[model samples]
Every structure is written in C-alpha cells, then in structure tokens.
Target chain A: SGFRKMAFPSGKVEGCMVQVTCGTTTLNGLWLDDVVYCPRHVICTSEDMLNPNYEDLLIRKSNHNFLVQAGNVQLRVIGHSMQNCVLKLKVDTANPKTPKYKFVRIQPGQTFSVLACYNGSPSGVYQCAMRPNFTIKGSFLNGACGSVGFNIDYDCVSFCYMHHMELPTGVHAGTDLEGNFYGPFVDRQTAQAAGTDTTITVNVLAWLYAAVINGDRWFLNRFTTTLNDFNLVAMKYNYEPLTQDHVDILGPLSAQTGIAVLDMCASLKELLQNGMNGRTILGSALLEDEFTPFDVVRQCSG
Target chain B: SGFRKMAFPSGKVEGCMVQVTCGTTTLNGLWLDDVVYCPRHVICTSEDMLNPNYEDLLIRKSNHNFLVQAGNVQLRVIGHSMQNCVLKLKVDTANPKTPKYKFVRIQPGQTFSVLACYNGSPSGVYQCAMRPNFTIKGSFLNGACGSVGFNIDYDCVSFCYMHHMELPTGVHAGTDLEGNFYGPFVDRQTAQAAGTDTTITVNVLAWLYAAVINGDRWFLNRFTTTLNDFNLVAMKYNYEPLTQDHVDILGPLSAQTGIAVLDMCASLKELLQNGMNGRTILGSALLEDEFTPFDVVRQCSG
Candidate 1:
C-alpha cells in the first residue's frame, strides 16, 4: 500500500538495500517481516544468470538520489541542494516519443494535487495514475544522509482550458482578462497592491522582454538589484536556474510584440520576485508551469 | 495538525529554524506558508524586560537529537549511535511520583499499534493521549547528519497481564503452562522447535538463575558464544544495553526462587539471542515489556 524504506550500506551512503525471498532459505537477510535491512550493497545472482526467473532492482545513484521508476510512471524527489525536496512525477504520454513530466511544489502545508493542471485548471484532460500510500521526511545535506525523498500524491487529469491572449495596444493598466493583466502597472507598488487585493498581476512584459533580448540589461538589472528584498518567501527559486527553453520561447515573441508580454502566473510572479531577491529560478519550475505557447500570447492591435 | 520541518542553518547542523509573525513587520524571515527556512540560528527577542508576548522553542540539542515534550507526554528517539531511531513515548502516570515510559520497537513493515499493551495485552487500563499527526525518517552516524529521529504511534493504555512463573526443580521436559515452559528442553533444538510450533518458550530458569546468581558462566558463556548465529532479526536489541533496573529485578528473584525465572517473552528471547549473537540487548527493551514485578515469579512445589 505504501513505500517502505531500506537502510544504506556502512561506510557508504550510495548504493541499494534489498530483500530476496527464495522458498525458506535466507542469505544475508535481516528478516524483518518483509523488509531486509542491508548494511551494504548486493547482487542477487542465481543459477540461471543469463535468463533468471526473478529479478528486482534497488539502488540510489550518485546523480539520481531519489528516483523510482515503475510501470508507466517515474517518481522522483528534486529541489535545490538547500531546499526541501519536491515531487516530480513523470507519466508516459499518449505521444509515444516524449513522456510528460509534472512537478508538484505546493504552498507549504498544502498537499500536492495530481489532478490539477499547471494553471490550477480542473482535472479532466488525462487519466491519472493510481495513487500510492506514502510520506516523505528529509533535509538537504552535502552528501547522502539527509537528501530528498518522495512518492506521488494522486493521479489527476492534467488540463488547462485558460489560454493566454495578446495585450491590446493602449490597453489601460488594471484591465484584467481571465485573471491576468493586460498592461503594465505605473509602478511596482501599484502592481504589488493589486496582488494584495487578490488580483495578483506581474510585470510580465518586462520579464518577458528581459528574457528575450540577450543583451538587454534594464529589467534584468532591476530584478537583480531588488532580489535580496524578495528573500522574504521560502521559495526554492533561490537556487534553481532558468532553462534554455524559456529563453527560446520568449526571444521571438519579444522581437515581434515590442511591449514584452501580458502579466499573470503566481509561478512567474514568485519567480520574478525570486530573481529580484537575487536567486536563480529553477528550469523545472518553469517547465512545471507549462510555460509554453499555452501560457503566453503576443501583443496585438485588436 | 502535524509537525513541520525546518532546515538547519548553513555551515552548521545544530540550532533552531524559526518563524515569527508581528503584524507583517518582517525581520530576518524566509516565510513559506507557515514554515521558515533558516540558514542560521537566531534569537527572537523584543520588548518586556525579561519576557515577550509570544515565544516558541525549537533546537536539536547535542544529547537529545529527537525530543519533543508536550503536556504530560514526552516523545523521544533513543537507540545506539549506529541504529535506526526508535520511539520512546513517556506519559505522566497517575502515580505522580513516577512517570511511565513505553518503548515501541515493532516488527518491520507492521505499524506500531498504540492500542496494544507492552506484551500484546488489551489496552483498557490507562486513558489515552490525543494522537497528533507526525512521521519520522533518519539514520545513524557520528554527527547530526544521520542521527536518530522519532514520533509516537498512538496513546494506548500501558498494561501487561502476562506474569512469568518460576521453573519447578524436578519438573520433566516438555511441560507448558500459560504458553511458557515448565522446564528446560533436553537441548536448544527442542526449545527452538517448540517455538516454531507456535508454543514459543525459552530457557527462562537458566536466564533468571544466571541473572540472580551472578558469575554463573554456564548459560552466559553459552549465549555469548552463539550470539552471532541469532543475529537474523533486524532487532535494535543488538546495540541496546540492558539496564541496571533489569539486574536489580532479576537479582532478588533468583535469590528467592532457585532455577532462574520461567521462560517467556519474545523480547527476552531476542535479547538472549542477541547476547548470544554478541550484541547488547538494550535496557529499554526490558523496560518496555514491563519486565517488573508483573513479569517474573518464584518456583513452587505445587
């Protein structure tokens, strides 16, 4: 019903902990009900090595610390070296070529919902994987002892019906569409005020502009200078680096629609704030938000 | 509803990770939903010469790696420096002079049942404590990186109905009462076979006699020589030392009754086996099964 733990080997933090049952004969077994506490790594080879009847793999790699792949799903624990571990579930997509990966980094005290989409949309698009009974407890460290650990929360349909639209030229500030901003605020205080008022808008154009133009220093510098002030939130963006895909998407959009992009996305807002507070935004976060053509739109004259 | 984790300060593994709210006038804070990821230890001090309006204490001490005291219950994690941390729940006993403590080292994969007594008896005696949501994960090491950690499973009434009876001097082998042996088996094989048959028994008289008489090398030497062979179960008794209280209880019993105490208790059996396997049988294990006046008895001609 739930995941069980196995101890690591002595004098080493990396490797596997295993349990093998062959009739009643026991070999290097601790025999605690069904668990085997291995103080070292082992290989359970049998007489028919070329074609064994039974086989099970269990090992923690140097790069992939908390990873368990089963059936069509792959579950992983990932975060910055100093942040609490977050769940990353990878599901085999209908598209045979690329598998779909979902990141679940919920608000503190909030359990992640697998049914929800990247933008808080209701679950109905895709059938979810069966949920497993599991709990996670860990801390980040220089080595293996207190590293990441996890299991998926639920299997929810991943769907996003809300789509981004181009900001109309001469669109006044405070204009909202689908809970997003149509134009830039006159100042940061007004933007923050809107967010406080439950209309949380972001400086989307500025961020998108900076993200697009490689040599542009205006908004990027602004974010860098004020980043430390935004260190108020315990966000993992402090250590997560932005991905190359984000830049590629924003580049051409910024070149075509001069004013940058429309504002929204708490994920991006916190990301921008994290940047202002002098931290690197994780590419995984951006990817998790589904920050693609689905999240952004071009500025239009309409 | 449950306990939340805070990260250790950078460059240090000890100290508190804190959260303070004062009308949103933020200080050195990393505010998550309700958690704060402190990169360093802090002292939250303010007005009122000696005290303040609100205060909370959270710091992992050098001696007590995992300890949390609330109301009449004190939950702790105690084990050898190289074993998994175990839950040691202490409750304020009705007998105010002496608080009662319970140790729960369950069979692996089987969740510790708080409703059960120390020796699998009913749980109708003590009023239970309200359960709180909590979980634990950790390992053993020289420092804080992988030390012991724990949280109690449930608040079950602590009571034991099973009482150990002394062996009769002239009783023949293979007699049983209350599921325990009346006399020692002709050999160890027979004793083990009895256990395998579900009528688990022990060389109780031998153990009690040796415990009381002291310097009795017969059984002691036998156990010490075979300790490793019995190192099959993943029992913490391997590193747990027998308490002075255990010796105190057995001393007088051996003096009063003759052929050591009667055989029973998987706890004691494992302890004896562990000793035979050359590992320390933790005193806590002895204390948990309520191995006091309730467990042992004297030999009788009847």
Candidate 2:
C-alpha cells in the first residue's frame, strides 16, 4: 500500500530568515516529495526595469547585507523514496529611479541555515527596493510552489554601510556640472524607495561619482579644472596650475578630502531629512549621464 | 546433528575388479567421489607409492609405449560418510623376484567403489590398498583395506603396444656396482647378467655401470648407452654410440622389429623409478637423483 497525499510544512522569515520542510507520499510514486526552494528578485528601476543585469544587482552591498536568515530545511518522501529539493535565498537591490532589477538563481534540495546581526546605525537615504522570490519543487511528481515579497528598511547607518563610503566633492561636481561629465553615478533614489536614508543616498551617489571620475583621468582632470576655476571666481583671485605631478596627486587627494566632508554633510542631512522633511532625505542623485539643476543643488543646504 | 559414524557399502573384487559406492557426512571437505582401478602385480620398489611419478618411468620413449592400459575398466567407491577423499589407482609392476609392493593413497573419510567392465578381465590381479594422507598435513592417517583375488590373463599386446621397442641393457658398473651386481648375480644364481633377457634389476645394474664409465654424462645417457650396446650385440655385433639421436632412431626400430624385445624398458624403468617411487626419492633428490636399483620396471612380453 502507498500513501495518497503529500505535505509541506510552513516556513517563516525574520529579518531575512526562512525555513522549509517538505514531505511526499507513495501514491504519486513519491511525487511532490522533493521540495525545491528558489529565491529571485528584480533589479527594478522606475524607468526601464526589464532585462536588468541580475548579477550586478546581486553583488551589491545593501541587498546581500540584509539581516534575514533561513534554517531548518529538510525533505521527506514515503516508501523509501528520496527527497530531492532546493533552497534559495535572494535579495533585490534595484534602483527605484530607473527600470533596473536583479534575478538570482538558487539550487534545489539545498538547506541553508543563517543568522543575521545588524549594527542598528542610520545611513543617509537612497532610492532602491528588493523583492525576493522563494520557490519549492517536489520530486517523483510535478509539484511546485513559490512566493515573492519585498524586504524594506529605512535605517541610515544600514543604508550607508550597504553603500560603503562616498565623497562630497564628487557629488558637488556632479551637481554643478550640467553635463554628463557630472556622472558615472549611482541610483540613490532607488535605494530610498527600498527604504534608505538621505545620507546613504548622498553617500552612494558621491561614491559612485568618485568611482567613475577616479576610474578615468579625463574625468578627474575635468573635475579639477572646474574646482580651480570655480574657486578663483568665488574668491575673486587668480588661479595658476601647479606642476603636472601636482595635478595627478590632487585628483585622488581632493576626492578623499571631499568624501570626509561629505560624511559631515551626511550626518547633517540625516538630522535635517529626519527632522524638517518628516519624510527622511530618502534619496539623492549624482550626475551619471546628466547633472543636477542649480535649484536641486540648493536643496542640499537643508 | 552431524554424522555420528561413516560407513561404506560392502563390495568385492574379482580378478583385479571391484564395485562399491562411497559416501560421507563427517568429512564434508573431501573430494572423494571417484573410483580408481589398478592392475595387480605392479609392485612399488621405490618409496612413496601413493604419489607415483609415472612420467619419470616413461622418459626417452618418443612415444610412450610402456603404459599398462586398464582396457575400458570401470570402478567406483560407494559408502556413507566418505568425503574429502581422493581415489587413487596404482599398479605394482615390481619384478616378482623382488620384495616390493604397490599401494594407493586415500584421504580421510573415503570409500572405494568397484565399477563393472573391469570385473572379468584375465591377468588383471590387483590388491586394492589405500593410504590416507591429507595434502595439508603430510601424514598417513590410515592404510588401505580389502584384498580380493581375481584371475585374468595378462593382456600383453596392449601393454607392449604402449611402449617403444628396445630394452635396457649393459654390464654392471658403478661405485657400488660391485655389491649390487654381485648380490643380484648370486641371488638369481646366474653367472652373468647379460643385457638381453634380464629384468629391470639386472638392467638397472648395467645402467649404473655405464654411468660410472661415462662419469660426467647424464644418467639418462648412461641408461641409453647400455640399451644401445645391448641392442647392437643382439643385432649381430654392430656397435653404435649411445646418443639421444641414436636412441631416437633405433629405439622405435627395435620395438618394431618384434624380436620379443622390450623396447620401452628404459622408459618404463624411468617412469616407475622416478614417477611411482615417491618416498625413497625426496627433497631435491627426488627430481635430481638417478633411479635406484629397487624401482619397479616391467614390459609386455610379446
């Protein structure tokens, strides 16, 4: 005699946690016994969200740094039938301002136990969101189920930690320059949409801009030219180029010094975004292919 | 429960013929289901009669013509509790004038089976004896039992047909030729033991004499020398050197000449001495040493 029905126990997710147990009977030839877990997420941008590079989104610092953990996964099949299943864990860190999403693939029949620890610090805001897709498939028969959800948060330190560090000079240059030269930027608005702080948004934008400029000599030289020219006009003084070596050294040094200043701005922005706006400074932007308007730049002054 | 006692069915031997069935329960490891039939009057002068080396006796006969054919002989060993036993068939062709006997070895828990077809052959007188020795342990556990006398005309044609012609010959010569030659001489009450018409005893004595003369030649060469010399003398004083080439040519020629001559005498002598005489020939000597005077040698007197 064989069994008739199959059963799969319910699972829970805390922070970023989940657990699943699957069982199958002999009637279906042990079908529906093997449970596969798949976790997928889209790197959605407000603009064009289709066909996003999921690998790039997955490698992001914020999405993978979630405090979610999964555990206690197992499979059960009747009549000496083996349980074949997969367990997947996914996090999406898609830009909220643009149509960009990430998709992750997880192997079936794998059990993963995880523990998450959060430092509970605030980071400036940014725009981004994550949607996780969890899937389970049974063996011996064609039986499958999946679930999707978005894990959102607003902690500033969490957002800042996720984006690592950024510079204020890069952000200023991006905002002042009204051309694509302002960018090589990050989608901070998306991070904010996913529930991040303004400080984190500015930080991520600054880092993204710096990353681009530092990556290319042409961009750095352009940024330096703008900085010296602007300083001379604002202070009513003559400016002269030092040595070529000095130019080379000034680029990285200025970027790093500007990042330190941005850290101060982030803290102040956090206070102001959390205080005056009521809606935290959830997002900001550095010029990627375009620069911010002067009016938008004024918004940074609290 | 295991077997309490072993038993063999009663049987009789008439004129070197016997019929019986053997069985066993106690000795379950023995391969003892076959029946052996040996013609009587094949005495064993050399020791170790159970493991006889018949090959040694049949040497130098381009065709082995000295073998005694049992002639469609049938025999069996039937009894209870006879297992793990080996059935052996042995013939004692020792000279009647000598004091030697032939015996067969039977492993533990074995019985003899007498088959028909050999029951009514004339000149087939055999004393069925058994020696029980396990191959693992070189010890005799039991001796053979049962002596049934039968009358069958010795089939000389078949016996002679098996061996090549030409008999063993030569005068007595050896370090111990003085004692061996003179003793057999005195015992048989003959002034001279010529190469012709002499039994294996006189023939071996002549071989030993030739061996001493040749000094460094192979023992087989000495025997061949004496045989060739005897044959030459018999063929009207024609002398030929005793070489392997000459034996190859003349030995078969002499046997075909049909002068009542035993051509395979040397072969039979070698086979009996080296093959059947097991005990007296031991260690490396069993293979290395020359045949002794006491080895049994016989031929069909046509």
Candidate 3:
C-alpha cells in the first residue's frame, strides 16, 4: 500500500449533498465512479488522477453545503491533495474468491461506465449501469485493469447522487449509501429565534420500568435514566451516587464518540476532571449530532 | 491583527466562502467592493457592515455552497448599498505604475471604487474587481479601519459566502477544525443493520513492502496502513511502540482530539491509554485531517 489517500473518523462516512461539484470542465478527468458522487460533484485519486493535482482538484465546491433534513452533521474536507487516500467503497464480500479493490471498472480507467440515460428500475428513461455506487481509482497504465487488483466491476452506479436535496429523493427513500432515515427539526420558533436567554432543566422523569407517581422521584428518575447523556456521574456531592472518581471517568467515556461536557461544558470539564486527586464528582458528559457535534447534541438533548 | 475575526490559521484563506453578506442598507453604510462575490451571498464587518447583522446576513444561503469548475474563481460584491456603491468593477494586472495590495485606494472608507464591470484577456469574459477577494472593512468612526497600519483600499470583495463541500481548494488540508476524509465503515450487514455487532478486522494482508502475506500482520497493516488513515502513530501500546511513556501523553493528547484505535473504537482508547504509567512522555498528536495535526500527516508519509 504505497498509499495515495484515505481519511475517515468523525461518525465516519454518512451521506448527504455536501459532496458536490464537477459541474463542468468537460476535461473528463472527473470522469467518475465514486467516493463522493454528490449529484456529480466528483472526487479523485490515483494520486489525484495522475497529478498536477487533478486540475487543482477540479476547482472544488462542497465545503459548507453539508445539507441535511434533520438539522445537522458536517464533516469537512476542503482542498485535500493527498495523504493516504481510499476511505470507503463496497462489494468486497470478504474477497469472495477475491476482490479487495484497487479500482473498479467501467471503461477507460478512473471508474467510468458509458451507456447514459440513467434513472433506475424498469420503464421511465430507465436502463442502468452508468450510475451504481461509482468508485473511481484509475491510473493503471501497465495493469490494463486488474492485471493485479487494478480492479473494476461496480457497473452498479455509485449512488446516483442521492437524488438532489431538501431530502425527498424522488420518494424512493428505502435507504442505502448508509441508510437510516427521517431527520430535520426546528420550530421552537426557529430554535428560539436567537431571542436569547436559553436555560432549562425542569426535570421530573423517574420510571426505570414503569410506576411513576412522580413528585421528583429523583428528578423523575433522572429523566427516564441518563437524560441528555454524556456520562460520568460518580456522586457523593451535590446529592450523591457515582464516586470512584466517577468510576475513573467512566472507563474512558465509551466512544460512540465521547467528550460531551454541556451543563455548561459540564462545569468546564468537571472543573478539570473534578478536583483530580482531591477527587470531586457530581457530574460530567459530552457527546453528538454535527454542528460541533450539534452543540453537544443541543446541550445534552436539552 | 488583534483578530476579532482574522482566523486565517494554516494555509491562509483557501476558498469556498465565508465571504458572504454585507451587501447594503442605503443606511449611510455598506459602500462595497469584494469578499465573496458569489452571484451575491454577502458579508460585512466594520463591526459587520451597518450591523443589525445586515438583515440576518441578507437572508443567507451560501453557508454551504463552495464552488469551482474553473471560472478563475468567483468572488463578488456588486452595486452595494449606502446606495449604488461601486457596481462590479475591473482590473487584472494593474500598476498605475503599481500598488496591487498591502492596501491603498481610499476616500471616506471601506475601500470604495466608483464605476464598474471588468474583464481582462486570455480570451476572457473575465471582467475583474468587485471580486478581488472582497475587503470592504468600513468603520472609521472610532479606529478608522486600522488607523496606522494603513489598510485602506478594499475594492476587493469580502467573503462571498461559499458553500460547496467535498474537499479541495488550495493544497491546505492541514486539517483539524476536526478532520479526516474517508471514515465510516459498517459491514456486519450494514453494521448490524442498526442491529449492532459491527465488529470487523476481517483480516487479510502482509505487505510492509510486499510478501505472500497472511492472517494478521497487525491485521494486515490495519487495512493497508491506516485503513482509514488520519495518521499519527508513536505508540506505547496495548502491545507497545509510542513509549517515552507515550511521549508523556503528548500534551493533553493534543488537547483531547486523541482517541483512535479503530477496531471497537480501538478497544476503547486502547482501554484508556492502556496501563498509563512511566511519566506521560512528550505528548504531541491531534494532527490528522483537522485535529491532531492530521496525525502527523498520517504516519509521516505512511
């Protein structure tokens, strides 16, 4: 793996329009397959398609348009030249006899297909092959193609740019390029219309399972347990419960992505890990969504 | 720059736009030139062009639409407000003998021009200016733009509100506003299809340089070295490597961006820096994509 490129970390590879551009230049280098086929926005490799930096990465665009129907999630990559590429692409089926990917085929290299008129499924301008999960990797020259994993086959189209935005996707929404649907919210008068003041706790949720006569059965069972959830509550102060130094920072905050800190950045990182050796712990948490992990998931889910 | 908002950071102003709004108000303010001439998303500052957040930033829409396809890059700020403020002006390689920048042209403030619509040659429709990368900076009321540093002429646009996503602008991936490009792998049938197990090391590799390779070369270079490459590996491990007692916890794990151990979130942060002892070591690392210096450019060139 003399490596050419690869990056992936934060909530890793989700989907949306934020990967757009490749509008035109007609040079055909952006002559696609996938990585980010945001409606045709294009992505490159083979050391950015044989260098000169893919025409300066074909002029780039999708840096902020990280669109969403559920409010937010943005993973930025603006102007990447190269540093070990290849993030994600499918159908290896554990090499089902063999298929690890160096580049999947269509035609002349960098994963192409030809044929045209693509929409999908029987009848209306439908036919297929040019747009199923695109996956460019070109620059084979001597291999001709897979002579040794120079690879090619995904004639299935790399997600026809998840059908242009505001989330509806012509209604097919069955989900794929990493599914999980229905998202977008904002009506609390446009999230407080910035009319600023923002503060609230007003809890009362106890019901570990059921029966809740409720009168503050422990702040209503801490809002049906673990409300807002960032984790780290070894009490013994301010009320009492978690304590072996919050179980030593709760075994490194269980990464489904951690570090949430929001009851005011969790009293400033629990006032610096809550008095360390002096040991103090009544609370702590940190966690996600998108905009800075959705402002700590909207203040730990408000 | 006392930087109330200079934030140039790493590669200094790569594009896609924060250059929007500040268009006009007819209210003795606006008077324009350039920042982000995107058809017109607008931007302001002289304490925010006529403040009041310029009509919530002129009904903004460019917060996510960066662009490129070669247009010599589009920056705009047309016919601004305090009324007919310099409409799309011109120039490419000017030198009224010469003074391209470091600041000049001034009248009352924010860098005014007068008459406009520009274009140069190279077969060009290329009118110029109202987009020289926007400058405007208006307020002289209390400090006069910069008072002594001079900084007058701004006929250059001021951030035309770019919004297009999917990396590439200037080879500036110095990363970490939180980064890494290709990460999001889920295959245990779509990571438990929401059903859960999501465990994959599903090994197969051996090429440190190249060999018949087999069952676990460190799970075959963790998948082509950096199976999701975001770099930075000076180990002290669940097995061993980063030792100097792990560079004494590399300066707060580069202020807590530190958390990578991929398989099962790297067995939960190597089970908390795995048996932390021997004096925290030199620290260092948050260098990947946009956080730990892009993990030292991913293994100093994996």
lDDT of 3 at A263: 26
Candidate 3 has an lDDT of 0.19
Off by over 4 Å in 1: A1-18, A21-149, A152-302, B1-302
lDDT of 2 by residue, B1-302 (tens): 00000111111121232322221111000111132322111222224233434334223222111133232432222321211112233223321222111223322212222111211221111111111111010100111111121111221100100000011221221101011111122111124433332122232332333222223123232243256545454234222223444344333334433311233344334534444332211111112111211111101111
Worst 10 residues of 2 chain B by lDDT: B156-165
Model 3: per-residue Cα lDDT over B18-108, one tens digit each = 2222233111111122321222112343344322333454345242222211124333322232111111222122212222233233211
Cα deviation in Å at residue B160, candidate 2? 84
Q: In candidate 2, which residue ranges exceed 4 Å CA deviation?
A: A1-16, A20-205, A212-214, A221-302, B1-302
In terms of TM-score, the best-performing candidate is: 3
TM-score of chain B of each: 0.19, 0.16, 0.21
- lDDT (tens digit, per residue) of candidate 1 on B1-302: 00111211110101111121222111121111222221111222223213322122222222243232222233232321211111111222222222122323221111111111111111111111111111111111111111111122122222111111111221112111111222232212121211211111122322334233322222333222122322233133332223334335555555554433322133345444444332212111121221223122311100
Clashes of 1: 21
What is the C-alpha local distance difference test score of each model? 0.21, 0.21, 0.19
